[PDB]
Amino acid sequence: AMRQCAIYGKGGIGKSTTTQNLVAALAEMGKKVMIVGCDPKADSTRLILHSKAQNTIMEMAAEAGTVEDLELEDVLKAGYGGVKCVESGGPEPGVGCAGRGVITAINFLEEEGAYEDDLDFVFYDVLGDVVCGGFAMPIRENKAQEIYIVCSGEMMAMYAANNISKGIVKYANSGSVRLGGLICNSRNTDREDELIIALANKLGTQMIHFVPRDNVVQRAEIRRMTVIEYDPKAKQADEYRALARKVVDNKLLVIPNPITMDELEELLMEFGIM
Amino acid sequence: AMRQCAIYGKGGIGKSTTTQNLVAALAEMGKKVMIVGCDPKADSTRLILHSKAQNTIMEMAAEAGTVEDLELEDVLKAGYGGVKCVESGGPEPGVGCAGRGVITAINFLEEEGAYEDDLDFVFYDVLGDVVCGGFAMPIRENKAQEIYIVCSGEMMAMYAANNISKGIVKYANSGSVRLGGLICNSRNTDREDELIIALANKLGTQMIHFVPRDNVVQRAEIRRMTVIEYDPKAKQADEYRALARKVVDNKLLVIPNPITMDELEELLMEFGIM
Amino acid sequence: SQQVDKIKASYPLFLDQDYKDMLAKKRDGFEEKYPQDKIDEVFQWTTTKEYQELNFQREALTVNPAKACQPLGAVLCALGFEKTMPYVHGSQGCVAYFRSYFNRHFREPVSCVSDSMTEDAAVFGGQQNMKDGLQNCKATYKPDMIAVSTTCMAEVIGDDLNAFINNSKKEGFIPDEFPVPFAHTPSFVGSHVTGWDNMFEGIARYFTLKSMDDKVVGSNKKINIVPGFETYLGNFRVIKRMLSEMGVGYSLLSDPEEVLDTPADGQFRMYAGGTTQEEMKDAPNALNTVLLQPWHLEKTKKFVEGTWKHEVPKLNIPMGLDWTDEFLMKVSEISGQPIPASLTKERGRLVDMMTDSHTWLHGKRFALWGDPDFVMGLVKFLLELGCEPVHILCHNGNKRWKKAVDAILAASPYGKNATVYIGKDLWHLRSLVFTDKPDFMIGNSYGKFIQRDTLHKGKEFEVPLIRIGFPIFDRHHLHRSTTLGYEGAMQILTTLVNSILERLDEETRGMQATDYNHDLVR
Amino acid sequence: MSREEVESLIQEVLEVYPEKARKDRNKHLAVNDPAVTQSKKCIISNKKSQPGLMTIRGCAYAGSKGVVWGPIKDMIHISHGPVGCGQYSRAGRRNYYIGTTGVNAFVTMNFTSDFQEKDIVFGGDKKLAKLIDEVETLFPLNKGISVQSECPIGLIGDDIESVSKVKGAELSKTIVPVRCEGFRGVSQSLGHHIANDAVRDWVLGKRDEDTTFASTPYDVAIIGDYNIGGDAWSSRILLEEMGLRCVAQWSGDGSISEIELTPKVKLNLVHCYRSMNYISRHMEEKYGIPWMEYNFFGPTKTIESLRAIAAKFDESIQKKCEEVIAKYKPEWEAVVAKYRPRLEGKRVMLYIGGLRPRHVIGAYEDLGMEVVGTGYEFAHNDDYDRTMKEMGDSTLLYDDVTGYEFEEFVKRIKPDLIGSGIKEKFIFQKMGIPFREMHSWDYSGPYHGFDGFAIFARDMDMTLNNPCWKKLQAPWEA
Numbered sequence A, B: 001a002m003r004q005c006a007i008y009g010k011g012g013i014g015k016s017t018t019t020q021n022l023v024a025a026l027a028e029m030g031k032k033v034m035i036v037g038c039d040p041k042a043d044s045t046r047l048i049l050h051s052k053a054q055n056t057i058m059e060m061a062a063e064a065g066t067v068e069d070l071e072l073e074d075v076l077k078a079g080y081g082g083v084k085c086v087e088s089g090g091p092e093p094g095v096g097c098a099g100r101g102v103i104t105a106i107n108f109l110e111e112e113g114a115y116e117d118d119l120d121f122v123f124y125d126v127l128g129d130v131v132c133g134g135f136a137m138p139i140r141e142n143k144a145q146e147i148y149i150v151c152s153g154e155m156m157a158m159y160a161a162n163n164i165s166k167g168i169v170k171y172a173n174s175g176s177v178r179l180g181g182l183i184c185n186s187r188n189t190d191r192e193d194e195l196i197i198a199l200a201n202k203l204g205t206q207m208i209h210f211v212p213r214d215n216v217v218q219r220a221e222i223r224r225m226t227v228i229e230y231d232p233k234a235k236q237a238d239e240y241r242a243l244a245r246k247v248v249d250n251k252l253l254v255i256p257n258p259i260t261m262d263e264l265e266e267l268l269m270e271f272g273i274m
Numbered sequence C: 001s002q003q004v005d006k007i008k009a010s011y012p013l014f015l016d017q018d019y020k021d022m023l024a025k026k027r028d029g030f031e032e033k034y035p036q037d038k039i040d041e042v043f044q045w046t047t048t049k050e051y052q053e054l055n056f057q058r059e060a061l062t063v064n065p066a067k068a069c070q071p072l073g074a075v076l077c078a079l080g081f082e083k084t085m086p087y088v089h090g091s092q093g094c095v096a097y098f099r100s101y102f103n104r105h106f107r108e109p110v111s112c113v114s115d116s117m118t119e120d121a122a123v124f125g126g127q128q129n130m131k132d133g134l135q136n137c138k139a140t141y142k143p144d145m146i147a148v149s150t151t152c153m154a155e156v157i158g159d160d161l162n163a164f165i166n167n168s169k170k171e172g173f174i175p176d177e178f179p180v181p182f183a184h185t186p187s188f189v190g191s192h193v194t195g196w197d198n199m200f201e202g203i204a205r206y207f208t209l210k211s212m213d214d215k216v217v218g219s220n221k222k223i224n225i226v227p228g229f230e231t232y233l234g235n236f237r238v239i240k241r242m243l244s245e246m247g248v249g250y251s252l253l254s255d256p257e258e259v260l261d262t263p264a265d266g267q268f269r270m271y272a273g274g275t276t277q278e279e280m281k282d283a284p285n286a287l288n289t290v291l292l293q294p295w296h297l298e299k300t301k302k303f304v305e306g307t308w309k310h311e312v313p314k315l316n317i318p319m320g321l322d323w324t325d326e327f328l329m330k331v332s333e334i335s336g337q338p339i340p341a342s343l344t345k346e347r348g349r350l351v352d353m354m355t356d357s358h359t360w361l362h363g364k365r366f367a368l369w370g371d372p373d374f375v376m377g378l379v380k381f382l383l384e385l386g387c388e389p390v391h392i393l394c395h396n397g398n399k400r401w402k403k404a405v406d407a408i409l410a411a412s413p414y415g416k417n418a419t420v421y422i423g424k425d426l427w428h429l430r431s432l433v434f435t436d437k438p439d440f441m442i443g444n445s446y447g448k449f450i451q452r453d454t455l456h457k458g459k460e461f462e463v464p465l466i467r468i469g470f471p472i473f474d475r476h477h478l479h480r481s482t483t484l485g486y487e488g489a490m491q492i493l494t495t496l497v498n499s500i501l502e503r504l505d506e507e508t509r510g511m512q513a514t515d516y517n518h519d520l521v522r
Numbered sequence D: 001m002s003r004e005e006v007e008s009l010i011q012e013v014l015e016v017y018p019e020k021a022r023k024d025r026n027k028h029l030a031v032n033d034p035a036v037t038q039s040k041k042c043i044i045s046n047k048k049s050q051p052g053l054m055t056i057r058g059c060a061y062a063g064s065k066g067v068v069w070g071p072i073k074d075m076i077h078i079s080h081g082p083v084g085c086g087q088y089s090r091a092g093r094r095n096y097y098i099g100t101t102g103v104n105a106f107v108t109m110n111f112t113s114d115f116q117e118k119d120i121v122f123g124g125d126k127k128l129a130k131l132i133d134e135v136e137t138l139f140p141l142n143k144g145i146s147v148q149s150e151c152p153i154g155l156i157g158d159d160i161e162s163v164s165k166v167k168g169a170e171l172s173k174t175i176v177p178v179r180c181e182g183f184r185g186v187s188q189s190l191g192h193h194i195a196n197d198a199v200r201d202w203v204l205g206k207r208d209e210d211t212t213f214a215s216t217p218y219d220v221a222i223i224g225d226y227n228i229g230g231d232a233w234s235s236r237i238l239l240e241e242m243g244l245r246c247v248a249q250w251s252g253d254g255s256i257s258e259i260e261l262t263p264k265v266k267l268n269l270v271h272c273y274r275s276m277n278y279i280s281r282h283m284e285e286k287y288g289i290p291w292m293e294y295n296f297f298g299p300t301k302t303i304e305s306l307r308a309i310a311a312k313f314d315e316s317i318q319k320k321c322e323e324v325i326a327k328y329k330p331e332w333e334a335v336v337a338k339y340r341p342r343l344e345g346k347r348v349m350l351y352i353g354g355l356r357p358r359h360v361i362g363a364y365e366d367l368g369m370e371v372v373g374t375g376y377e378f379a380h381n382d383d384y385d386r387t388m389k390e391m392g393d394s395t396l397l398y399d400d401v402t403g404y405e406f407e408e409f410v411k412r413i414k415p416d417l418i419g420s421g422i423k424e425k426f427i428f429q430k431m432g433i434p435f436r437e438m439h440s441w442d443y444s445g446p447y448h449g450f451d452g453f454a455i456f457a458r459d460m461d462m463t464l465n466n467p468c469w470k471k472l473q474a475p476w477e478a
């Protein structure tokens, strides 16, 4: 047991939200899971805690001076389905160095055990942009062993996915972290399913699942909760449960095989029209 | 003449794409505009150059050793409608410090004149996340004088907008940069228009425009171009032209008045259901 | 043991048998050091051209650099202004280092503060540090001005110094009118001299930019002088001497000669005389501006010409005969003041010293390093003496500067076998003095280890170091010396000639063997 | 004199501080009272230094490269980051060694990755790798490497750990990645803890499976002695003279080999508590190697330690210990006999790192001098507890003293001699107060042990009673 995963993807593509709901389905399956938010905005855990956690690793550490003076109890809280949640702190937009925040945070958890438990899964909900080595912390030597890139059939989202893949390569070769697959969070693009599958193949991975765009996600989001909790009978809920099973049963872990910009354009023209 | 603007917003909310199309409308109005990409991924100028520019300030500087050895001619290229485009370089995801890249890039342009011309508008297409002081470069002392935050009626997108507003405050008070308004790039959320307007008011600004979600944007995007160029008669094109006029005629510039997380939740409950 | 009457310190002490034996046992017992043979072998290897080549193929490793990061220069520049307190926004560690680095070279106190940014200050961006730091600084040390510089940390996280300072004032942390000039000084760009440049330019902007309206060139009848990174008290003083000697109205911008030479009379003066803020505010009204060390005052040059509209003369650092002549003549032209017979005679005397010593000098090959301007000038003077600057190394040098020096070398037969090296550290030079061995090497204290290495190969391979430059830590008060003008020239000349004679006396001190050439008169 | 006059002094100085800073500083100024064993006695340490108050603290980098890692002879230490840290730090500390600098020993040298802008923007992780190769090629005789993180490295998040592990496995060389970014922590203190952990994880464990080393019942190790001016050697000679076998010195004339050997020692002698206690505890809980603190500053303290140490062994050792004490007795005795009269009753104020401020007190009292005040830059309350039993009742205590504070304090206290760092020296010399560097021994010989004591004594007299002091005021003034 114990599978550390890292979620990445185009900014605002829905990684946080999807991860939130996904984990809910895991918890519903009796799977003990912990989610480590790696976004300066502690928004990786709202749907589980039913509230925007303020006890972030960085802010908390600052209160007690040195991060060394911090203690897990103060930053780790369990929410829906007993899912444990932790949030790397972060400066407000346009100031500081959020990257370092994540670095220190991950190191903190590592040293205070945290992972050291009976957790079935650990999810690193990283920010969309990932502009530095710091945000790649979850993909280091002995952290996440499987990454899942969220994206849509949108040119930009696909580029981001491929671009992110490139960065992953540097870490895949130096360790054992592998790309499990792509999770298409539908954004109603024309030949969406075909597009993502095409890209997935080109990269050498798979399209783990196609999450339909359903406003239920938002309706539940508004009420601070995952679709599962908000409406277990909702069609979208089954979709998330499906994705959960897919991830649990996934045995396909590969080293991303990126494509050139020209190759991407070519792919878009062939699978993105009509 | 000469209005420097900075575009910010939730990651992947569509800032780049909207900016691309928006500028196209400006160019169509005979407005000479330049766009400075501030995202490590040189994706801020694709739709104008009809190709993903490789001549980024950072990569180019690296080729010539010191950034001091770089020359504008090598990194500045004009595309559709004579719109001049420049791209701050950047490391691949998970390595380096993209923030510094932007800092050096902006400084480079500043020193080599660049802005120093007869430009009607200059647009800083910053990345969604903005995790450091570096990405706030465009909002410094004598850079952008008006910021426009792109967002949707999505809880997360709104939070991001408000969170970003907070960061802006630090710079607004130290200089003259002001928030012009919010541009709602529709993502088909229930009471979207009401939500954004509500937030806009709460912040003390306005909802400059509501950009409808139209797959035409994608169809044009695929063919490396702005909706204007791809289909001038397309309904969406008129929408962008409208937004352009709105920005040109905008005289409302304010210092963002952020709200507490609780206040945001409250707003979501009142304007986001039914 | 120790003999109370004649106590032996570390040096003679650890040479005692019981100590030697202990070290021998320690080495043989737990050090596992390489056999003396292997050591001797690898050493002889490090002196070959083969090694040197691999040494020069380095693209990442820098060994024993001949430079320092920007902030150091920013600080020195800051110290040149009246009751100004250097403030480095960033990690406190740097400031401690800066202070000590200068403490050791000047053997004087070095006042500088840091707003002590730590872990969370880096993550969250230390705007508070700026606010509190400034307030605390003013209140505690009561400076009239605070010159903000930076640390790589603050440079990476893009801390908007200006925004912070502005907000610091607006939020009542310090009086809105309190002079707080700033400058971004990324450790990882250029070097200490660049820091000096940036810091100066920032200060120049602060007291000028806005108030440029009432300014008129020449109205103050003064000639602005920018020393740049200068670590010889004599260098500031000589310029001021000559200028006053000609009766030239001048204004030395950034003059820390006083701060770096406070008299020890039972009283501690934290701040001392320096460039008054008024001199800075009035600076644009000057006839023109002369940059003593142009090669690292690039940004300042552009600001002076661009904003101050001063037609800065293309003058080289006033070092050696020719360049000092050019400097004086240019100043003479700008101020309309004729070069006094006072200086004319002084020039004549230097020439006389040159003629008296040309015999021993002519032909002596040297290796040297230091800041661009300093080196460039040292080279010119060396050429004027008939010496050969075979190995000219300037770690913080650039392509254009190299060309400049090359042209200077191509102008004289003595430069024939010289080679300019930019972006090269002292380890590179170490190889040069081994492969193509010069007579002596002119440089800072860091070269003492190169001489140690050279001697270890053999006495005839030893290349004596002549301490001229920065920093000089193993010699007391050399920072008082002069290198600029005829005065500096004379000192350098004397120093060189005597250095030559010294080594000769040593080489010929062997009684019966080499003492036959031990002449009383030379 | 008198805690009342002192408390008034503290309160007076605090007056210039803006309320916020005033509040904090008061907690770091206290009047000593023996018996009190805690912070109760208005003394809190190891906290964020107030911005702008010009403190004398350093950075984590200084803690690792500067004091702990740098001292290792046969090992190349890379100042990873922009030039500066390495340069300013190059051959500053007098951690003496025995080696052919450049071929097998590298202390004197400053190896740096000389970060340039493009290395930050793109992350010099590749540069590091290439650098290492260049090192192996140009310095074949190195027995290991260590990357000392400068601020940038911590921020940009360069996977230096991986670069070290990959290159290490390839080249079969020990490459130690240290995260001593200057900003991390509050002083050089955390740097120590970090460096210690680095040693623990990357070096110590190397010889755990190896049993080839021939151990003896008297195998000891000196930890926390950086051989400043020869300090370690002067201490080692005594220990070995009394039958002990110093297997390793931690960061003195230290080699990677002896560091790896350390886990085989029968006892660990800790001199510098603040810097090595971390690893000392680890070696105990793991290898079961007991550790004890000791002091070699002054004969009384030295003798006290020598006995306490020999007491941990059998009679042959203890008997020898006495022979040693006997041997050196006439010497240190002659020393005090000559110098004490010249320094009798002379008052001294101190301020140093995180050990000496209390450790040297003994030595001072042995020459009849009285330490009227002392303080540390980075010491934690651990040290302060120990400090209180050393300081005479009503002596002034200060943690992370601001420049302004030390000045004012000195103004009223009017000590006959002051001992602090380089950044202090000239300030007080200007004031006419005999100053002596207690970090670098003011370029003087060892102070540790008996041989060092003679030197320490001479130095104090030399300066304290120097004729230069009478000449501060010009005759034409009064």
Ligand SMILES: Nc1ncnc2c1ncn2[C@@H]1O[C@H](COP(=O)(O)OP(=O)(O)O)[C@@H](O)[C@H]1O
Pocket (backbone or CB within 6 Å): A010, A011, A012, A013, A014, A015, A016, A017, A018, A128, A185, A186, A211, A212, A213, A214, A215, A216, A217, A218, A221, B011, B153, B154, B155, B156, B157
């Ligand atoms: N399948 C979906 N259907 C509808 N809205 C969705 C769906 N997935 C995500 N969203 C909405 O997209 C917005 C951003 O999601 P978020 O997870 O915060 O993005 P990111 O992970 O990239 O930071 C929120 O309103 C989110 O609920």
Ligand SMILES: Nc1ncnc2c1ncn2[C@@H]1O[C@H](COP(=O)(O)OP(=O)(O)O)[C@@H](O)[C@H]1O
Pocket (backbone or CB within 6 Å): A011, A154, A155, A156, A157, B010, B011, B012, B013, B014, B015, B016, B017, B018, B128, B185, B186, B211, B212, B213, B214, B215, B216, B217, B218, B221
């Ligand atoms: N109004 C819209 N209708 C449809 N798709 C849109 C619209 N606006 C943006 N998009 C799509 O959203 C995806 C991301 O846009 P992008 O500008 O790159 O995001 P960001 O600015 O935040 O980096 C691309 O497919 C983009 O074309």
Ligand code: CFM
Pocket (backbone or CB within 6 Å): D063, D067, D093, D188, D226, D228, D272, D273, D274, D275, D352, D353, D354, D355, D356, D357, D438, D439, D440
């Ligand atoms: S200021 Fe020692 S805790 Fe440390 S360099 Fe000096 S009083 Fe250090 S005894 Fe030591 S050899 Fe030191 S003298 Fe502890 S090692 S960080 Mo500055």
Ligand code: CLF
Pocket (backbone or CB within 6 Å): C069, C070, C071, C091, C092, C093, C094, C095, C097, C150, C151, C152, C153, C187, C188, D058, D059, D060, D061, D062, D081, D082, D083, D084, D085, D086, D088, D149, D150, D151, D152, D180, D181, D182, D183
């Ligand atoms: S607290 Fe310490 S010395 Fe400072 S940076 Fe941080 S690790 Fe280093 Fe380095 S190059 Fe110069 S001295 Fe810095 S400004 Fe950067």
Ligand code: SF4
Pocket (backbone or CB within 6 Å): A096, A097, A098, A099, A100, A131, A132, A133, A134, B096, B097, B098, B099, B100, B131, B132, B133, B134, C156, C157, C158, D155, D156, D157
């Ligand atoms: S790009 Fe990253 S490493 Fe750089 S300042 Fe920003 S958060 Fe930090």
Ligand code: ALF
Pocket (backbone or CB within 6 Å): A009, A010, A011, A012, A013, A014, A015, A016, A039, A043, A126, A127, A128, A129, B010, B011, B012, B128
């Ligand atoms: F908050 Al995100 F991509 F997870 F912008």
Ligand code: ALF
Pocket (backbone or CB within 6 Å): A010, A011, A012, A128, A129, B009, B010, B011, B012, B013, B014, B015, B016, B039, B043, B126, B127, B128, B129
């Ligand atoms: F590329 Al973006 F927000 F503009 F992720």
Ligand SMILES: [Ca+2]
Pocket (backbone or CB within 6 Å): C106, C107, C108, C109, D426
């Ligand atoms: Ca002095």
Ligand SMILES: [Mg+2]
Pocket (backbone or CB within 6 Å): A015, A016, A039, A043, A044, A125, A126, A127, A128
């Ligand atoms: Mg997120």
Ligand SMILES: [Mg+2]
Pocket (backbone or CB within 6 Å): B015, B016, B039, B043, B044, B125, B126, B127, B128
């Ligand atoms: Mg973008």
